[PDB]
Amino acid sequence: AALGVQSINWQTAFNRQAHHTDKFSSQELILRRGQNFQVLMIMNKGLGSNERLEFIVSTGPYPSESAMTKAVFPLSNGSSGGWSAVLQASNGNTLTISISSPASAPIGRYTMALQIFSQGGISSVKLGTFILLFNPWLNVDSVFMGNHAEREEYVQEDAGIIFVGSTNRIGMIGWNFGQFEEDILSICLSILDRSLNFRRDAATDVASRNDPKYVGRVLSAMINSNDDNGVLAGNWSGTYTGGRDPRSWDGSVEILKNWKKSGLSPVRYGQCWVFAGTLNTALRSLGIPSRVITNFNSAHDTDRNLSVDVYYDPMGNPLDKGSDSVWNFHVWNEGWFVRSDLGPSYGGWQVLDATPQERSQGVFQCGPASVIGVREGDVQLNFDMPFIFAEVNADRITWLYDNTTGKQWKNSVNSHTIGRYISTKAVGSNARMDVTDKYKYPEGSDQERQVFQKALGKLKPEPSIIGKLKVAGMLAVGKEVNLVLLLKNLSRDTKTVTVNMTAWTIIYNGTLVHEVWKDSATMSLDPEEEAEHPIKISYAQYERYLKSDNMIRITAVCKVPDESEVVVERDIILDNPTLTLEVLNEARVRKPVNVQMLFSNPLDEPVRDCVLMVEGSGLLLGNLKIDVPTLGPKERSRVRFDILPSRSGTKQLLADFSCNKFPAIKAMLSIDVAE
């Protein structure tokens, strides 16, 4: 009889353990490039001396040896360079074979076939399929990350933290990356077979999948539904009918499964952190060390001049003209890999942004941008350096505009307000890791200014009154809003100040929603005198126009005869009433755990359409939806439900409580699941 295979033992558990891919909730053979794995092949007879076995691995619709999307290698003994198979042992008709791949092989789904040369003939049989990923553990892989703890956080961690809020109140929200959840890896892999690049030229796309730079840039495009049937549809209007309020999501899992389940129809809706969380999931799943970055006072320069304009009218009203040019915060991602296209000094963290802000080559994609390069102002390098630099270090110009006259007049220039408290989750904990120093030289330093000029060069070759807005008291949705405008006269004369104020509800990006309060006043001040003008906004006044951001823009334009206007600005954040999660017993893997949701209604009216959304990788499969009954005025809701832990360690439980009066109240609970 001719030499032939009877069966193959992929030793899946063993290889996956060795290749750090055992966390994926999948039964497939998942491997990482540049690392070898062992298989056992039972032949029908012994391997003859004059016989030969040749392995054939191939990926994509056009497997080409030239493009490295197809490799044919013989069962040798001397481990070869790229793909190779070594016969480490023969027992009976069983061949113990060690197969290795190149650290440069394209990532994705491969199929393996065997060609046998026996008794003068040739026979072929398919052995099976496997998934090959980037290998952050391999010193020669470009995504290599040497530090154990860092690699664990940036690749293996599925529970995360994303900072939000404002420069006045930095907050955080939990996020379930869930890269290990059922079918997630599969979906993230399918994204590459659905991009514009892949449809344009499938043969070249698949070949380029050996480049984290390429893969990274594609994902920045494919995570938003713009141009290519991507995953998320952005919406910063404060009205999300036809979908879900961006603030209600708790992770990337429900989003990716919804995308697939709907025939790849846009998931409605998302905002920057939603795009970044979802991107972070794809990146970690594929093996590219990744993390989420939050830039407060993020500028959106729309004409590459490193400058952004914001306008107000003499009555203190923020004009749409630029109300969103400087977001309270903007969230993006960083990918870790070397930049062979830029040089040794630019390797490391690379900015990637899936939020559709600026088009790049006609498509909404952004990055990779070397963080190091951004700090030095080398915005001539790929990709999208100019835009990102502006996001973190653009100058802010305030303008006064009177539509009635057509007149426009510059009020002031601030070179240090853009790009502050750039944060990311600390490794192994929830602490805030500030990385501003990584994106720019110290504000107020000559370097900072020297770099600015350098970057701008590559793109294009006294007041007597001081004001300040302080928050008086507690700010919570349900309570009246109390502020005070503090004004002081630094001149030697007695000044009379005319003050025009407004309060608008906004979306964190700056999108103006509705005016909820306005007022004018004139106060006389003697030299060095300090006065306070109270600003009181009732719940009734803002409740109808306040969105899930729970933000309000407060402005006061003040002026004294013969002096330029003084503009005082302050965005405030109202806290949602507290939502609480409690475990009623010790948490052990595979053992039922009793949990409790607690919420008290602070309003004098009842809350209806109450829905609880709970999820957490390793704590429960998918998302749990509970319909809680109407909660009367000042009453408490106590919801019970059990979770069933599947993986030990530190897990993150997340919940979203939504009702007619309070959309997207959030909760998070750390739970140590024991074995």
Known binding-site positions for Ca(2+): 221, 224, 226-227, 229, 301, 303, 305, 307, 324, 393, 415, 443, 448
Q: Interface with Mg ion includes 609 (CB under 5 A)?
A: no
Q: With binding defined as CB under 5 A, does residue 358 bind Ca ion?
A: no
CB 536 within 8 A of CB 568: no
For residue 224, the surrounding DSSP H or E stretch is none
* Nearest CB to Cl ion, comparing residues 72 and 621: 621
Residue nearest Ca ion, Cβ-based: 230
d(CA 418, CA 295): 9
- Least distance in angstroms from the C-beta of 225 to Ca ion: 6
Residues tagged in the binding site annotation: 221, 224, 226-227, 229, 301, 303, 305, 307, 324, 393, 415, 443, 448
Active-site entry in 141, 158, 353, 395:
353
3-state secondary structure of 446: helix
287 to 326, contacts with Mg ion by CB under 5 A?
301, 303, 305, 307
> Contacting Ca ion (CB under 5 A), which of 105, 143, 159, 221?
221
* 85, 74 contact by CB (below 8 A): yes
Q: Does 270 bind Ca ion (CB under 5 A)?
A: no
Query: Which of positions 393-432 make contact with Ca ion (CB under 5 A)?
Result: 393, 415-416
Distance of alpha carbon 523 from alpha carbon 498, whole angstroms: 7
- What's the rounded Cα separation, in Å, for the pair 230 and 129? 27
Alpha carbons within 13 angstroms on the beta-carbon side of residue 440 total: 29
By the rule CB under 5 A, 482 interacts with Cl ion = no
| Residues 365-394 interacting with Ca ion (rule: CB under 5 A) | 393
Nearest to 287 by CA among 58, 85, 65, 34: 34
Q: Which of residues 224-263 bind Ca ion (CB under 5 A)?
A: 224, 226-228, 230
Smaller CB separation from Cl ion, 185 or 610: 185
Residue 357 near residue 316 (C-beta atoms within 8 A)? no
**H-helix or E-strand spanning residue 213:** helix 212-222
Q: Which two tokens stand for residue 254?
A: 């429900």
Is 298 in contact with 331 (CB distance < 8 Å)?
no
AA identity, residue 515 = E
The site partner of 186 among Cl ion, Ca ion, Mg ion, none (C-beta below 5 to 8 Å per kind) is Cl ion
Distance (Å, rounded) from C-alpha 52 to C-alpha 125?
14
Does residue 99 sit in helix, strand or coil?
strand
The smaller minimum CB distance to Ca ion, of residues 221 and 369, is found at 221
- Give ∠ CA 370-511-498 in degrees, rounded to 5: 115
Q: Are the C-beta atoms of residues 617 and 158 closer than 8 Å to each other?
A: yes
Q: Does 493 bind Mg ion (CB under 5 A)?
A: no
Q: How far is the CB of 43 from Cl ion (least distance, A)?
A: 31
Q: Give the shortest CB-379-to-Mg ion separation in angstroms.
A: 14
Annotated catalytic residue 353: yes
CB of 257 to Ca ion, least distance (A): 19
Token pair listed for 265 = 């129809």
Q: Considering only CA atoms, which of 382, 398, 375 is closest in space to residue 452?
A: 375
Distances (CA, A) of 592 to 241, 642, 643: 37, 6, 6
SS3 153: helix
Q: How far is the CB of 383 from Ca ion (least distance, A)?
A: 15
Q: How far is the CB of 237 from Ca ion (least distance, A)?
A: 19
Please, which residue, 185 or 215, has the CB nearer to Cl ion? 185
Nearest-angstrom CA–CA distance, 620 and 645:
6
Which of 22, 49, 20, 56 is closest to 35 using CA atoms? 20
Cβ-based nearer residue to Ca ion, 360 or 500: 360
Phi first, then psi: give them for residue 175, nearest 5 degrees: -145, 130
Closer residue to Ca ion, CB minimum distance, 21 or 297: 297
CB of 232 to Ca ion, least distance (A): 9
Reference 503, options 471, 455, 461, 457; nearest CA is: 471
Quick one: what does residue 303 bind among Cl ion, Ca ion, Mg ion, none, with the CB cut-off 5 to 8 Å set by partner type? Mg ion
Pick one of 26, 123, 415, 482: the residue that binds Cl ion (CB under 5 A): 26
- Should residue 532 be labelled a site residue for Mg ion when binding is judged by CB under 5 A? no
Considering only residues 161 to 190 of the shown chain, the ones binding Cl ion according to CB under 5 A are: 183, 185-186
Contact between 305 and Cl ion by CB under 5 A: the answer reads: no
* Catalytic site residue from 19, 188, 250, 272: 272
Closest CB to Cl ion among residues 283, 483: 283
Catalytic residue (one of 300, 330, 395, 533) = 330
Q: Which is nearer to Mg ion, 26 or 305 (CB)?
A: 305
Active site residue 272: yes
Q: Which residues bind Mg ion (CB under 5 A)?
A: 301, 303, 305, 307
Q: Which residues bind Cl ion (CB under 5 A)?
A: 26, 183, 185-186
Q: Which residues bind Ca ion (CB under 5 A)?
A: 221, 224, 226-228, 230, 393, 415-416
**Active site positions, annotated:** 272, 330, 353
